[PDB]
Structure 1
């Protein structure tokens, strides 16, 4: 029932997506932790690099992002490529496809070097521009696996270092990972990005914010940390998605 889903998503709204992002989502929690142990510019660069290698993991996303945050806390990172050349083969949760993953980091090194504090601010105010800068640095389609995710994670990191919140653009689609694809197959025969773009347009909640609502809940995150009115909306959503 796409209409019912859009209604509940719209009731949750940007404010509800933001509450979930900032209080429930373990990937955000991992980022906030890392931000206390490394400088803001290096933090953002690392988040983008990490996102672009966050596929075909040897663990769940929550475990992987916590491993990343703990690994880099307090480290003196002089080259992001060399840091990942050391990190990935010693990691618990990202041991596979290392050559391909390192080649992606190599391709974005020059782009990452442009991320001064001001450039980060500018990209947070125009995430559609960031999306293309990342995709073109890699030389891949804007919609290929991890690219949209890297914009999502940038938005978490930028919120943390800039202390301000800019909603994601409506035009950036959801990430099509296992959790979202599996949920979507239970709801519809439509392809996930098309189904969720319709719900985004009907609700006015951008797809990346819908993803932020859904992804932690699909991982079994509790909703009892939400304030009462939001908790009731999330309970309604859980009936649909779990």
Structure 2
């Protein structure tokens, strides 16, 4: 795990933060969010993207497919009242059919909230209170990453996220951490012990110069290839190889 930790650091050190930012523009999720922002403008588009991130849990299929549906839905539809229209979308989407009333309830709490795209740290604190969760919880930090996508699209700029916002420990991140040999307890346990997993990726961030929410992009892109055998050039070959250390960590 210490030896694996060193291998991971010295491999990702090969990629600058500049290369990571470039790689990140090819995330299918970035394209969906950017299509919605181009259609609706910065304020409305960023609100829609925010709401989508806040309910991106217990999906039927892949994260990426859910985001593609979101992009197509809002890119070709006029939006008048944001709460109403978003709740209607929740009732329609095949990715969101599980626990729809609890989803609507969460969306209703954050409905009227306008995020501050220039101070994402302030926004994370505000979201923690509105939604009612610890700031390190996976859906909160993932929402910050989505907000960065919306800002970068809107303004046509790069922006490197802070080191002090940790990685979102979903089931994909937990499995990949296990697959790279960085943890000895199972991925299902890692979801509960998310702070311990966050501590590992913080170490990696400090030593590589790649902040945790940008590391998240590398794991998600790599996961597409290791778990499903798809988008095989999403990251360099040597990055993929890091997450194939344990037996089972290959496509069927």
TM superposition score category, shorter chain reference: 0.7 to 0.9
For residues 222 and 59 of structure 1, do their structure 2 counterparts lie closer, same or farther at Cα, with a shift above 3 Å needed? Answer: closer
Residue 199 of structure 1 aligns with which residue? 204
Query: What are the residue-to-residue correspondences of 1:1-242 with 2, within 5 Å?
Result: 1-23=4-26, 25-112=27-114, 115=115, 119-120=116-117, 122-123=118-119, 127-186=120-179, 187-189=181-183, 191-220=196-225, 221-222=230-231, 224=233, 234-242=236-244
For residues 109 and 151 of structure 1, do their structure 2 counterparts lie closer, same or farther at Cα, with a shift above 3 Å needed? Answer: same
- Offset at residue 69 of structure 1 (A): 0.6
Residue by residue, what CA displacement relative to the aligned partner does 1:106-129 show, whole Å, maximum 9, x if unpaired?
A: 1112322xx5xxx43x23xxx222
Secondary structure of residue in 1 paired with 2:57: coil
Quote the RMSD (CA, aligned, Å): 1.8
2: distance between equivalents of 1:222 and 1:76? 32
1: distance between equivalents of 2:112 and 2:39? 24
* Bigger mean CA deviation after superposition, 183-192 or 94-103: 183-192
Residue by residue, what CA displacement relative to the aligned partner does 1:102-152 show, whole Å, maximum 9, x if unpaired?
A: 12221112322xx5xxx43x23xxx22221121122122112231000001
Secondary structure of residue in 1 paired with 2:112: helix
Residue 228 of structure 1 aligns with which residue? none
Residue by residue, what CA displacement relative to the aligned partner does 1:200-239 show, whole Å, maximum 9, x if unpaired?
A: 11112100010111202211253647xxxxx7xx211111
| Consecutive aligned runs of 4 or more in structure 1 exceeding 3 Å deviation | 221-225
> In the alignment, is the contact (CA less than 8 A) between 2:87 and 2:107 conserved in 1?
no
> In the alignment, is the contact (CA less than 8 A) between 1:59 and 1:92 conserved in 2?
no
1: distance between equivalents of 2:9 and 2:165? 17
Q: Which structure carries more relative contact order (alpha carbon 8 Å, separation 6+)? A: 1
Residue 192 of structure 2 aligns with which residue? none
- Offset at residue 89 of structure 1 (A): 2.1
Secondary structure of residue in 2 paired with 1:197: helix
Query: What is the TM-score normalised by the length of structure 1?
Result: 0.86
- Offset at residue 47 of structure 1 (A): 0.7
For residues 111 and 163 of structure 1, do their structure 2 counterparts lie closer, same or farther at Cα, with a shift above 3 Å needed? Answer: same
1: distance between equivalents of 2:106 and 2:81? 14
1: distance between equivalents of 2:125 and 2:78? 29
Residue 190 of structure 2 aligns with which residue? none
For structure 2, the 5+ residue unaligned runs are 185-195, 245-252
- Offset at residue 170 of structure 1 (A): 0.3
Secondary structure of residue in 1 paired with 2:95: coil
For structure 1, the 5+ residue unaligned runs are 226-230
Residue by residue, what CA displacement relative to the aligned partner does 1:166-205 show, whole Å, maximum 9, x if unpaired?
A: 1011011111111110011222226421211111111121
2: distance between equivalents of 1:101 and 1:144? 17
Secondary structure of residue in 2 paired with 1:236: helix
